Write a protein that binds this ligand. Structure first.
Ligand SMILES: [Zn+2]
Ligand SMILES: [Zn+2]
Ligand SMILES: [Zn+2]
Lengths: 127, 135
């Protein structure tokens, strides 16, 4: 794949669509989109190990870190609860050892200690 | 290698489907159950894209990397599941065309259950989910 997409949903109002693009194998991944339904301020934004939604976000497993790879840091919601995301990450990848396709993207209650998982979805092939 | 998929859709249809493949060149065991179905046959397919932005509508066509006609074939052609009188379909498939690695890899794609029988014309897409890596 050169493109992936993730629909974030949870038990509460947090919802979003996040795109990923890696035009070059092993190159930087562009991450962008928007998440709404969040409290104003910082929220942890992570790839978790398993694309297992059988128990909602609770089944996502730990931070993806094949023996921190999944730590995309934080998104910031505005006064309307909307987080616009536009990131370049050179650690995640859409192939190889750091492949995140089929894993889970999670937005957290607090800045990353990041607290509850508000919304998540499985990262799917988009192109 | 193990994978899982939670099927959701606009009505009562829902299910959990598991995947396991012991060797890269071996068959994939597919098992789980789907509820909320009409009694009888339902098309059961992997579709190309793990894009659920428009629910099942955005999943693209049957997964077909080798550009074959439909059977049960496209890589993603898993034929039909059968729902009982209570609308419950048990899934227990071994398939040697799908894989969890290589070019027939279905991780990150979409599993879809259909309104009607796949004639091996499956009709509308009732429920779907993105296939994810599992523990
Ligand atoms: Zn996390
Ligand atoms: Zn189909
Ligand atoms: Zn087909």
């Amino acid at each position: 794949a050169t493109k992936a997409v993730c629909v974030l949903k949870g038990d509460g109002p947090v919802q979003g669509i996040i795109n990923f693009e890696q035009k070059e194998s092993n190159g930087p991944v562009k991450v962008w989109g928007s998440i709404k339904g969040l409290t104003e301020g910082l929220h942890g934004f992570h790839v978790h190990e398993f694309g297992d939604n059988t128990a909602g976000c609770t089944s996502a497993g730990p931070h993806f870190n094949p023996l921190h790879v999944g730590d995309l840091r934080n998104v910031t919601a505005d006064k309307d609860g909307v987080a616009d995301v536009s990131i370049e990450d050179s650690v995640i990848s859409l192939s190889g050892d750091h492949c995140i396709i089929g894993r889970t993207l999670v937005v957290h209650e607090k800045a990353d200690n990041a607290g509850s998982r508000l919304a998540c979805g499985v990262i799917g092939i988009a192109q």
